[PDB]
From Swiss-Prot:
This is Beta-lactamase. It catalyses: a beta-lactam + H2O = a substituted beta-amino acid. It comes from Staphylococcus aureus. The keyword GTP-binding does not apply. Pfam families: Beta-lactamase2, LPAM_1. The class A beta-lactamase family has a specific amino-acid numbering system, sometimes called Ambler or ABL numbering and often misspelt as Amber. A multiple sequence alignment was used to derive a consensus sequence and then the consensus was numbered taking into account insertions and deletions. This allows use of identical numbers, e.g. for active site residues, despite differences in protein length. UniProt always uses natural numbering of residues, hence there appear to be differences in numbering between this entry and some papers. It comes from the Bacteria. Substrate binds at K201, S202, G203. Its EC number is 3.5.2.6. The keyword Signal applies. Belongs to the class-A beta-lactamase family.
Length: 257
């Protein structure tokens, strides 16, 4: 199935970057075009924090007040005036896509500027974090704010997590959250073969049908992962996205491996 054909069928724009970490073979399609990354950045922020906090120290607590709360914080709203461990913060952001948990994580790292700084060091000059949740969800094709390209985002996910500086315990804790996440069952998880294990983080911005999924894919019989970045959008501001597009893009791309 050709990807050009998939863009016509759904009337959408597809951006893909896949890297087999075993062979180093790559599959690219509009892999240098910018798209809003939305909530898939939650994975990037959790990883960056886990580089500076050992597994044994995730029990450490942070205080949450009224001022921290942003829209769509299903777990964090129950914590106003309370303390929460860093472990529970990462779980709320990854599993429930909690917006307040993500802003607090970025604060712990030091703020948007420390995140950007870390990306530079990893060699990522493209990913451009500017706003916190939920302003980062307001995408305009005329702005570079909070956008990245499928190639830049995928090489960063490979460096941070697959070939990164995480300890065994931290890497496993994070990947297990991503494997047991039920929010991405309609995406990459829906299009790859049944024997394949998929650890993903999905995303949806408010405008232009911005629907994304990023994953670590384990083919039956291979312990090294295939990193898979799928960013898609439509032409009108108010377009509603169709998840089958991403399931189909994933089935089509996996045929190359």
């Amino acid at each position: 199935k050709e990807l050009n054909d998939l863009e016509k069928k759904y009337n959408a724009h597809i951006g893909v970057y896949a890297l087999d970490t075993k062979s180093g073979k790559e599959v690219k399609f509009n892999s240098d075009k910018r798209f809003a990354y939305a909530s898939t950045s939650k994975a990037i922020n959790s990883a960056i924090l886990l580089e500076q906090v050992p597994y044994n120290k995730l029990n450490k607590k942070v205080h949450i007040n009224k001022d921290d709360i942003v829209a769509y914080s299903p777990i964090l709203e129950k914590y106003v005036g309370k303390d929460i461990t860093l472990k529970a913060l990462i779980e709320a952001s990854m599993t429930y896509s909690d917006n307040t948990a993500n802003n607090k994580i970025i604060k712990e790292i030091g703020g948007i500027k420390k995140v950007k700084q870390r990306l530079k060091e990893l060699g990522d000059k493209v990913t451009n974090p500017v706003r916190y949740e939920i302003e980062l969800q307001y995408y305009s094709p005329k702005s570079k704010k909070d956008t990245s390209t499928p190639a830049a985002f995928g090489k960063t996910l490979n460096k941070l997590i697959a070939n990164g500086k995480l300890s065994k315990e931290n890497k496993k804790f994070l990947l297990d959250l991503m494997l047991n996440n039920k929010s991405g069952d309609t995406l990459i998880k829906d299009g790859v073969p049944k024997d394949y294990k998929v650890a993903d983080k999905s995303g949806q911005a408010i405008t232009y049908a911005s629907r994304n999924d990023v994953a670590f894919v384990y083919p039956k019989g291979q312990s090294e992962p295939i990193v898979l970045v799928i960013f898609t959008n439509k032409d009108n501001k108010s377009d509603k996205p169709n998840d089958k597009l991403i399931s189909e893009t994933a089935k089509s791309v996996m045929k190359e491996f």
